[PDB]
């Protein structure tokens, strides 16, 4: 019964780690799962899990939203970060600063509700 | 109609293999939920 | 008159001290709430099985009793008188006067042979219990300074008298009450200072039977399988053959001359009544040894092929007439099969066979080439050749005549004196019988429960006319189990089917001893038309009755329910009966009903109508998971033997059982620590929370470690550790059963939980996938709202409301856990299962397992090693089986706990170290995040989920036709306030103006069914 | 003494634990990863030269610099290959 | 599969069928029948 549970788990990992990419945390290795490779072993299986591990982190200042022309902007697919004097929008898991334009953010209401909104120019 | 049950645990009226088992003290109890409630 | 005995008459059943125990005793007791006869100040009341006698008075009006049979001089009667100085007891042939009643001389006239004499030392209640068992007259008594009272008091032993007489009646020597005893089982509660403070009469009613089944005085709500009802046999019958002639044993045993052992004689015995009592009149001190039977039972059986083999041997060879024996007699003269069933009767026949001169009428073969097979006869006289020479011829050198004469003489010692031997061989292999013991046949009772005896086959059941036909050589039919199911009646030769008596299971539905003492009873797998109702104690083995009252009898596919009124209203299941029927306490009575599956809800489906939530709720729910069980160790020899070295030496001969048990328990114990490590030791670094605990308005005080506590546990963790209860331990220890501490202390587990909480609060899900990256908590919440498909602006614009909802939800968890009793029931179940298994193991040490005693030292100190070892083997086998069962159940429970711990580890990874998209994996609604809290044997997860609320109907369209192009919403759904058209995100009503940037176009508006005309600005 | 042999209690080599009495190991105040688990948080190891008992370490302490306006973002990554045996 | 047959055993009926001496002897083997009944009741409840 114990080995059957182990083999059911191995079949699930074969389906979701080898035949797909898994969003389940720690199911297919430590880190963000990229892919996995099976290798037969005498009475079992070995899974070589290839994961993406972030490294070399840097601190930045961040704000929930950006106030421009009296309009509050929230990042579309990023977070607002600051080099120190200017402001960019970056993707979360890799520092790729972009000029805050009205294409990578969206408007929602005025800069009178967000607790922490920051003034800056949203290039159109 | 494709799975054949043996006992199903329902009332037996005094008077085959189920009878043998019952005479030897082995019984089947009905499930709490009926097939209709599961449906 | 008559009055109610209440709970009176309990007496200490043994002389053993006991404390803080619930002991079960089978003895002659006064049933609770019994009808006792009250006499006032008297007649000669009978002695049924023993008497409880009470006397409320303040003037010593009652002075004694006179127990006897005829109470006259023609028999012997016991006499007990309490003279102010002493108590006089006298069993003696008394011509008692007619009105005994201070002048003691007015009781009896004559006192003939006296075999036993004895002398010894606010109203008051003098309670007495008189019993007469095995010639002993036992008296228990108690005085109480006081309609009998309604309190509990137990009687102490006073005296056992070896009076040796039957007592059928008695009379009080002059308010006194007289109740009668019956064989009953009682559950007695002993106090800490060893006082019986309460009892339960197990046979009083169904609730008492439940109390005795559970070995407790308080029963929780539920349904309990208590016992099985069994119809008792009304009468008994005997059916033996009609033969009446006596067997020809006289011509066998009383023969002038017996045969020679080499040519032994065989006689067939048939068609006769075999009375073996006629034996026991042979040459005194004779040997009567039976194989497969006992001599005292032969008169009660029936035999198939009875043969009497007779011969004469010398005394010292009688030992050779037995299975498997070797020697000249057993090898060349008369061999018995190893599987011989029968009897050997040998007796000295010196005064019949010995001849002063030498008797040569009795020969024996001394030399044979090969041995004989069982019951074979060799009457050849060829010359035996022990030499290689062609001996063919006459005797001589290495050439012996095979037969030699015993030459019995009166002057020989016993060993060489003649013995007459008769071997009775019979097949008890049932089969048609011709020889039967002396037994009277009754009439044949069919279609009725009876005790039956057919030619010695005994049983209980119902006999019916059978349609099977036996072949002439067949007398019984057998079923799969090899039990007799059909029998040919020996007299009428008809075939009868045997069926067991009606029986079934009984369950008791109790609302809880606290709430009420009313019960309902379920007779399982029975219809009410067949529920036993026999008035006299001849049925329903429980022996109590639950009489019908009309509306109190209901029929379910699970059985007949008595004592619950069926109602047509449906509720949630409270106590499950089965087949859809549940029961509950109305409040006032027990009601049965069909369980409700829930409330109906027709969803308003349309081809153009959509419900969009307008608000949300932050729900915090709890999931409790066991992670480990108590690690246990067993000192095998201490458990089995316990200070007995003889037992240990005898144990060594049983194998590697204890090594295997120790290895299995060590495997379980190591697995427990592996489980805990896999659940809690996920983090690599022990993260710490920031000293300044501001998190955008989110309050984690109830879950974060509290520095005041000496353990640094959170308030919720303290509540959990107080809600799960984690001298009985010492009693277990004394038997070799020990608990091993977990490797990780509760402080270390709380430290792991704190590290997990700090990591998730200060860094989100990043610390589970690499370096912990700090992020403000409101920003992390914005990420988790993006996870469930809600735009970030929803959180930032509702930050205070969301924080308050979370704080109130987290506040209610303390109450929800502490309030609902069975909340930590899974962890408490783990604890209780371990405690119950160890207590069962300890209690199994009092089982005799068929031995004379459960104490090894008593067996060794009272028996010779030959028989002592037999008894000790019974005990060791029983205890080994107890240990093996314990370890197997532990392995199964450990497998289940390991599955639970693997699930807890998966939840720790996927709900605490990340946000899960799996439905219902981390709480009811859309999972936002989760917090772990250690609990005494497991983990509690606080799942925070997003739940839509306040939904509103709108009209929707698959697409929008504009300019002739079909338009579909890029990240939402088209909704209409009634006249205008917006695009909204799915799980939160946020209508937006339909522009060419929140929409995309694919094809003309000619294929999209349901497409709607509007303008895409 | 049922096991006959006796290990000398030289004082510094006798220790009390919830698991029982440990004789032949010296309790230290350093914290290492568990090598041989004794129980109740106590582990044992060969120091190098003698056997040492110690409270086990749950890991290296750490403090995330939480603020309400600071975010750490990775600038680089590593492709890791781990092994899982089933 | 979701559930299996719920089974009940009358321990005394199976071991000592219709013999009273056997039952009074069986009263000396401890809580074996009680433990068996408890295990089977646990299984039966687990099925529901
Ligand atoms: C981020 O700031 C904290 C606090 O000043 C500092 O300890 C840490 O080293 C910084 N992170 C990096 C990658 O420099
Ligand atoms: C701000 O970003 C600009 C690039 O647009 C550049 O000056 C530098 O990366 C940042 N400046 C400082 C002072 O960090
Ligand atoms: C941003 O500009 C508005 C408008 O003048 C002002 O009220 C607000 O204080 C500014 N924000 C900061 C952080 O100075
Ligand atoms: C039992 O008897 C002792 C006698 O010393 C007494 O102290 C104790 O209170 C008694 N137990 C009770 C009354 O429950
Ligand atoms: C043998 O004879 C005696 C005397 O007549 C008699 O009492 C006895 O029963 C006989 N034995 C048998 C086995 O019939
Ligand atoms: C029980 O017996 C009665 C009488 O024969 C019958 O009417 C009833 O249907 C039986 N019960 C069931 C469940 O069949
Ligand atoms: C739309 O729903 C109504 C009511 O359910 C139904 O009568 C109609 O046929 C549906 N539309 C189409 C195209 O069938
Ligand atoms: C949403 O629900 C909260 C209660 O938790 C309430 O105070 C608030 O007014 C609701 N919002 C709307 C728009 O009704
Ligand atoms: C957090 O909650 C606790 C308990 O409900 C309360 O005592 C404390 O004052 C709260 N803290 C804040 C900052 O509101
Ligand atoms: C939606 O419409 C149905 C029927 O038209 C109605 O029963 C239901 O209450 C409506 N729901 C809302 C949220 O208004
Ligand atoms: C159309 O939606 C607007 C909100 O944008 C609302 O004010 C108006 O009442 C809606 N029209 C109708 C007919 O309800
Ligand atoms: C929508 O507009 C097109 C434009 O010609 C027209 O053909 C079609 O009939 C309109 N549909 C409805 C439902 O009004
Ligand atoms: C934000 O963080 C700073 C420093 O940690 C603290 O002084 C301030 O109180 C925080 N914000 C609020 C609203 O308290
Ligand atoms: C990223 O890491 C690699 C080594 O894994 C190194 O060679 C490279 O220079 C790093 N890139 C940056 C931008 O630091």
């Amino acid at each position: 019964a114990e080995i059957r549970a182990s083999a059911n788990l191995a079949a699930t990992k074969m389906s979701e780690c080898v035949l797909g990419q898994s969003k389940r945390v720690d199911f297919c290795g430590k880190g963000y799962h990229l892919m996995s490779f099976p290798q037969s072993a005498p009475h079992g299986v070995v899974f070589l899990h290839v994961t993406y591990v972030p490294a070399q982190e840097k601190n930045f200042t961040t704000a929930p939203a950006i106030c421009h022309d009296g309009k509050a902007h929230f990042p579309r697919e990023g977070v607002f970060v600051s080099n120190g004097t200017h402001w960019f929008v970056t993707q979360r898991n890799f520092y790729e600063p972009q000029i805050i334009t009205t294409d990578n953010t969206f408007v929602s209401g005025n800069c009178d509700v967000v607790i922490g909104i920051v003034n800056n120019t949203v290039y159109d | 109609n494709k799975v054949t049950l043996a006992d199903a645990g329902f009332i037996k009226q005094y008077g085959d293999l189920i009878c043998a088992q019952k005479f030897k003290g082995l019984t089947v109890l009905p499930p709490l939920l009926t097939d209709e409630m599961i449906a | 008159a008559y009055t109610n005995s209440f709970t009176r008459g309990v007496y200490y059943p043994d002389k053993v001290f006991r404390s803080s125990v619930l002991h079960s005793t089978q003895d002659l007791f006064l049933p609770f709430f019994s009808n006792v006869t009250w006499f006032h100040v008297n007649p000669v009341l009978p002695f049924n099985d023993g008497v409880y006698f009470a006397s409320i008075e303040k003037s010593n009006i009652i002075r004694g009793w006179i127990f006897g049979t005829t109470l006259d001089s023609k028999t012997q009667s016991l006499l007990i008188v309490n003279n102010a100085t002493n108590v006089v007891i006298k069993v003696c042939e008394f011509q008692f006067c007619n009105d005994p009643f201070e002048s003691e001389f007015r009781v009896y006239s004559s006192a003939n042979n006296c075999t036993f004499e004895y002398v010894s030392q606010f109203k008051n209640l003098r309670e007495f219990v008189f019993k007469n068992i095995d010639g002993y007259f036992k008296i228990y008594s108690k005085h109480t300074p006081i309609d009998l009272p309604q309190g509990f008091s137990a009687l102490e032993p006073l005296v056992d008298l070896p009076i040796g007489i039957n007592i059928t009646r008695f009379q009080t020597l002059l308010a006194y009450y007289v109740g009668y005893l019956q064989p009953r089982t009682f559950l007695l509660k002993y106090n800490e200072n060893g006082t019986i403070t309460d009892a339960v009469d197990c046979a009083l009613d169904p609730l008492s039977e439940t109390k005795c089944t559970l070995k407790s005085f308080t029963v929780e709500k539920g349904i309990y399988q208590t016992s099985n009802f069994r119809v008792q046999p009304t009468e008994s019958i005997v059916r033996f053959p009609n033969i009446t002639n006596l067997c020809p044993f006289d011509e066998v045993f009383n023969a002038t001359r017996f045969a020679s052992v080499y040519a032994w004689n065989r006689k067939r015995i048939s068609n006769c009544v075999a009375d073996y009592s006629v034996l026991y009149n042979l040459a005194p001190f004779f040997t009567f040894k039976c194989y497969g039977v006992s001599p005292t039972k032969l008169n009660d059986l029936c035999f198939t092929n009875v043969y009497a083999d007779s011969f004469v041997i010398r005394g010292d060879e009688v030992r050779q007439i037995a299975p498997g024996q070797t020697g000249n007699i057993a090898d060349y003269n008369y061999k018995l099969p190893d599987d011989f069933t029968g009897c050997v009767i040998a007796w000295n026949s010196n005064k019949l066979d010995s001849k002063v001169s030498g008797n040569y009428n009795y020969l024996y073969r001394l030399f044979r080439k090969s041995n004989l097979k069982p019951f074979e006869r060799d009457i050849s006289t060829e010359i035996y050749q022990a030499g290689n020479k062609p001996c063919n011829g006459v005797a001589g050198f290495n050439c012996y005549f095979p037969l030699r004469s015993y030459s019995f003489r009166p002057t020989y010692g016993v060993g060489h004196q003649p013995y007459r031997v008769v071997v009775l061989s019979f097949e008890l292999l049932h089969a048609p019988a011709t020889v039967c013991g002396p037994k009277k046949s009754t009439n044949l009772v069919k279609n009725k429960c009876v005790n039956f005896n057919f030619n010695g086959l005994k049983g209980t059941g119902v006999l019916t006319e059978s349609n099977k036909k036996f072949l002439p050589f067949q007398q019984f039919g057998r079923d799969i189990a090899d039990t007799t199911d059909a029998v040919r009646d020996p007299q009428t030769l008809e075939i009868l089917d045997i069926t067991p008596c009606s029986f079934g299971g009984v369950s008791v539905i109790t609302p809880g001893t606290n709430t009420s003492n009313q019960v309902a009873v379920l007779y399982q797998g029975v219809n009410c038309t067949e529920v036993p109702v026999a008035i006299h104690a001849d049925q329903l083995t429980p022996t109590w009755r639950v009489y019908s009252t009309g509306s109190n009898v209901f029929q379910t596919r699970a059985g007949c329910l008595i004592g619950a009124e069926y109602v047509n209203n449906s509720y949630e299941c409270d106590i499950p009966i089965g087949a859809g029927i549940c029961a509950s306490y109305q409040t006032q009575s027990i009601i049965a009903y069909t369980m409700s599956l829930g409330a109906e809800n027709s969803v308003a489906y349309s081809n153009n109508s959509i419900a969009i939530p307008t608000n949300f709720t932050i729900s915090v729910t709890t999931e409790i998971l066991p992670v480990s069980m108590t690690k246990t160790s067993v000192d095998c020899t201490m458990y089995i033997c316990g200070d007995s070295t003889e037992c240990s030496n005898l144990l060594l001969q049983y194998g590697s059982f204890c090594t295997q048990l120790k290895r299995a328990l060590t495997g379980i114990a190591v697995e427990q620590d592996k489980n805990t490590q896999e659940v809690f030791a996920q983090v690599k670094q022990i993260y710490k929370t920031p000293p300044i605990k501001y998190f955008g308005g989110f309050n984690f005080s109830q879950i974060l470690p509290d520095p005041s506590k000496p353990s640094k546990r959170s308030p919720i963790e303290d509540l959990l550790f107080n809600k799960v209860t984690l001298d009985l331990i010492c009693a277990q220890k004394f038997k070799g059963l020990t608990v091993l501490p977990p490797l990780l202390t509760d402080e270390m587990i709380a430290q792991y939980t704190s590290a997990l909480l700090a990591g998730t609060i200060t860094s989100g899900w990043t610390f589970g996938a690499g370096p912990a990256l700090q992020i403000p908590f409101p920003m992390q919440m914005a990420y988790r709202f993006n996870g469930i498909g809600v735009t970030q602006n929803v959180l930032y614009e509702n930050q205070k409301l969301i924080a308050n909802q979370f704080n109130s939800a987290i506040g209610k968890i303390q109450d929800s856990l502490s309030s609902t009793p069975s909340a930590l029931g899974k962890l408490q179940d783990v604890v209780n299962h371990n405690a119950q298994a160890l207590n069962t193991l300890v209690k199994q040490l009092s089982s005799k397992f068929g031995a004379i005693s459960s104490v090894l030292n008593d067996i060794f100190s009272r028996l010779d090693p030959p028989e002592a070892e037999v008894q000790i083997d019974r005990l060791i086998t029983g205890r080994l089986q107890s240990l093996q069962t314990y370890v197997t159940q532990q392995l199964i429970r450990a497998a289940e706990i390991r599955a639970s711990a693997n699930l807890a580890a998966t939840k720790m990874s996927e709900c605490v170290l990340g946000q899960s998209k799996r439905v219902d994996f981390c709480g009811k609604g859309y999972h936002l995040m989760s917090f772990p809290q250690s609990a005494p044997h497991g983990v509690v997860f606080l799942h925070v989920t997003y739940v839509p609320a306040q939904e509103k109907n709108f009209t929707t369209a698959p697409a929008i036709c504009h300019d002739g192009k079909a338009h579909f919403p890029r990240e939402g759904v088209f909704v209409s306030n009634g006249t205008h058209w917006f695009v909204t995100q799915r799980n939160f009503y946020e209508p937006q103006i339909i522009t060419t940037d929140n929409t995309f176009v694919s094809g003309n508006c000619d294929v999209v069914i349901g497409i709607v005309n509007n303008t895409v600005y």
Side-chain angles (χ1 to χ4, degrees), chain C residues 426-466 468 470-491:
Chain C
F426 34 80
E427 299 185 313
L428 302 151
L429 293 137
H430 277 355
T434 334
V435 178
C436 281
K439 219 94 163 73
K440 279 213 50 41
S441 313
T442 87
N443 304 69
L444 193 59
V445 178
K446 274 179 266 161
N447 311 320
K448 192 200 256 227
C449 270
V450 314
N451 298 301
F452 57 73
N453 184 346
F454 286 95
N455 304 332
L457 173 154
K458 303 179 71 41
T460 307
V462 193
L463 306 150
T464 65
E465 286 141 53
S466 169
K468 318 201 283 244
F470 286 11
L471 291 196
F473 61 91
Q474 298 172 320
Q475 190 80 352
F476 297 116
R478 264 192 214 139
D479 87 284
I480 302 304
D482 220 34
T483 189
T484 303
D485 47 40
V487 50
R488 145 176 305 148
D489 180 276
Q491 268 141 343

Side-chain angles (χ1 to χ4, degrees), chain C residues 191-195:
Chain C
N191 204 12
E192 94 257 26
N193 54 41
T195 300

Side-chain angles (χ1 to χ4, degrees), chain C residues 863 865-866 868-884:
Chain C
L863 286 180
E869 274 55 5
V870 182
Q871 308 294 310
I872 305 289
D873 180 75
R874 300 225 178 106
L875 272 191
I876 282 175
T877 279
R879 275 151 195 209
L880 262 174
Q881 194 55 66
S882 310
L883 276 177
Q884 198 63 240

Side-chain angles (χ1 to χ4, degrees), chain C residues 85 149 282 297 409 481 537 565 577 880 910 920 948 954:
Chain C
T85 85
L282 310 166
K297 303 272 185 13
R409 293 193 165 83
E565 165 53 315
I577 311 305
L880 262 174
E910 293 182 37
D920 292 336
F954 305 96

